[PDB]
Design a binder for this molecule. Structure first.
Ligand SMILES: [K+]
Ligand SMILES: [Mg+2]
Ligand SMILES: [Mg+2]
Length: 272
DNA sequence: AAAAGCGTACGC
DNA sequence: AAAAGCGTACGC
């Protein structure tokens, strides 16, 4: 049987409907049960958000800094819908704690908890299934670890790394995200370098650490000039996007005792 | 011009 | 509340 790890806040938006009125807390938990059955899960762990990553904030103070601006500029109707939706999501998450191992850690993102759980107990299961729409969770794909997205309704396997993210493997995916950044997370990338130029540069010169050694790179294009002045940006971004490497550091950032407790809690779940 | 990179609206 | 989301289509 399998392990299933749910990105719970991410999953909540499956029930955001501008037209619908009623609570979804019971239907939220039933959906997780249904997913558990679809992915043959003997163990399901649900993860929630609880603040911006203290780790990522320490390396990039503007991490998700667009949030408070984006939420301030919502219309009257959007604010009213959101306040209902988020009240309902809180109740859904409460009700979920009755039934499944359900984790928040203050100042730690679900991403880091998921990455750590996979490495900690994933080998005790036949397969691990990740329930998230978030594409950078594919930094955790292996032959034994896959992802399902409710928005796209797609399954994502390691063999399909290229078809999805236009890269060969996890390391290339990490290198490309570090170069490109992520506007949604307010992580600046190298100006003028997107997916096409980024992949072309990675395939020629290698992964981000190799590219930094060779700086300045040759070429007279404006985006290469921007790349050659971006050493500090590239190192910083690598720490922000390399989920497998820094997941434990991200949990430890909020306290050694928090890491200790979470480690024990996860190992106890696997024994049940 | 063209593509690329870029910015934004919206469904679930 | 340093609360509170993703990918996608789409147009310049
Ligand atoms: K179209
Ligand atoms: Mg998240
Ligand atoms: Mg995104």
């Amino acid at each position: 049987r399998n392990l299933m790890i749910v990105d719970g806040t991410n999953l909540g938006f499956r029930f955001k409907h501008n037209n619908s009125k009623k609570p979804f807390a019971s239907s939220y938990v039933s959906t997780i049960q249904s997913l558990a059955k679809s992915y043959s899960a003997r163990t399901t762990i649900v993860l929630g958000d609880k603040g911006k990553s203290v780790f990522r904030l320490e390396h990039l103070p503007e991490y998700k800094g667009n949030r408070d601006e984006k939420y301030a500029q919502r219309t009257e109707e959007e604010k009213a819908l959101d306040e209902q939706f988020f009240e309902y999501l809180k109740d859904a998450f409460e009700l979920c704690k009755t039934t499944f191992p359900t984790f928040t850690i203050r100042g730690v993102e679900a991403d880091d908890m998921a990455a750590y759980i996979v490495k900690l107990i994933g080998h005790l299961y036949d397969h691990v299934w990740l329930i998230s729409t978030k594409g950078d969770w594919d930094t955790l794909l292996t032959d034994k670890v896959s992802r399902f997205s409710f928005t796209t309704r797609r399954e994502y396997h390691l063999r399909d790394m290229y078809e999805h993210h236009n890269v060969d493997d996890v390391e290339q995916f990490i290198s490309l995200k570090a170069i490109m950044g992520d506007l949604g997370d307010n992580i600046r990338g190298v100006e003028g370098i997107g997916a096409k130029r980024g992949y072309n540069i990675i395939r020629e010169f290698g992964n981000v650490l190799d590219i930094i050694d060779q700086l300045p790179l040759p070429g007279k294009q404006k985006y290469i000039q921007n790349l050659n002045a971006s050493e500090e940006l590239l190192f910083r971004n690598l720490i922000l996007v390399d989920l497998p490497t820094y997941c434990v550091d991200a949990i430890a950032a909020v306290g050694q005792d928090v890491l200790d407790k979470f480690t024990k809690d996860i190992l106890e779940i696997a024994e049940q």
